[PDB]
Design a protein around this ligand. Structure first.
Ligand SMILES: C[C@@H](O)[C@@H](C=O)[C@@H]1NC(C(=O)O)=C(S[C@@H]2CN[C@H](C(=O)N(C)C)C2)[C@@H]1C
Length: 270
């Protein structure tokens, strides 16, 4: 009862032509295992979207280190990265590992990301190692939170593919790589994300539940979102939407991400 894949491709190609850039998508119906991709194996910059996987890496570490989420981290006199809305307010108090993970995912706090990378996960190399450990052989993180957003065409640093992002989200949300407590916590963090209102969330009816993480590099019209979507009385759908434009000076488009998401989700004829 689903739409022919070529219909969906044809719609995405027209949207690409309107956008003036590249759109890559992959979606997984976790109940039927039906999938759909377009440019699904092309690399796109992750931008800040890696932070959802960073939070997962922290939870995986906590599953083996009792009490890790409650550990308090202080960062007096640290120079805080731009776009650190939570960490810049908690210097006097410090923040727990859980609070840092929630902030990095839900507010895209760069300071929280670099604090977790430095102090728990082992830098970009350790982030990449975590993804390898769940069978993602595509993801790579090469640089720290600010520098990874250059989004230069042809530069494979700090990239993944829509398929790999969606497949890794599926593993983390519903597979065995995290325990029940950790899955539930990860999903609750994604559900509370605050930066995705104009992207995948804008593509679904208001009574569906979404958990997501966005990325906005700020150059090369490059922006993205990936999500778990719970339709009414239907198995969850995992979706990744990544975009870029050839011109350094172009702006990204939230609306194109929302429209691509709508096209892909409608193709499952839920
Ligand atoms: C490198 C980092 O600084 C960015 C990562 O990609 C941050 N993460 C994103 C994101 O999309 O998640 C924004 S965009 C910002 C978060 N939402 C705001 C927004 O959508 N507005 C103001 C409309 C703007 C950061 C720069």
């Amino acid at each position: 009862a689903s739409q022919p894949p070529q219909v969906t491709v044809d719609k995405l190609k027209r949207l690409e032509n309107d956008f003036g850039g590249r759109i890559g998508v992959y979606a997984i119906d976790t109940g039927s295992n039906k999938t759909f991709g377009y440019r699904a194996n092309e690399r796109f910059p992750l931008c800040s979207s890696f932070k959802g996987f960073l939070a997962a890496a922290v939870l995986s570490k906590s599953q083996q280190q009792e009490g890790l989420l409650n550990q308090r981290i202080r960062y007096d006199n640290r120079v805080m990265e731009p776009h650190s809305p939570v960490t810049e307010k908690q210097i006097t108090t410090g923040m727990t590992v859980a609070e840092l993970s929630a902030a990095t995912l839900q507010y895209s706090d760069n300071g929280a990301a670099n604090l977790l990378l430095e102090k728990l996960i082992g830098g970009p190399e350790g982030m990449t190692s975590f993804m390898r450990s769940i069978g993602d052989n595509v993801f790579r993180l090469d640089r720290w939170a600010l520098e990874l957003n250059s989004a230069i065409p042809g530069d494979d640093r700090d990239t993944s593919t829509p398929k790999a992002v969606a497949e890794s989200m599926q593993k983390l949300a519903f597979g065995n790589v995290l325990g029940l407590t950790e899955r539930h916590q990860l999903m609750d963090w994604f559900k509370g994300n605050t930066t995705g209102g104009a992207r995948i969330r804008a593509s679904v009816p208001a009574n569906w539940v979404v958990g997501d993480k966005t990325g906005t590099c700020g150059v090369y019209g490059t922006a993205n979102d990936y999500a778990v979507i719970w339709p009414v009385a239907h198995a969850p759908i995992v979706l990744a939407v990544y975009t870029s434009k050839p011109d350094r000076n172009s702006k990204h488009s939230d609306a194109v991400i929302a429209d691509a998401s709508r096209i892909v989700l409608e193709s499952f004829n839920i």
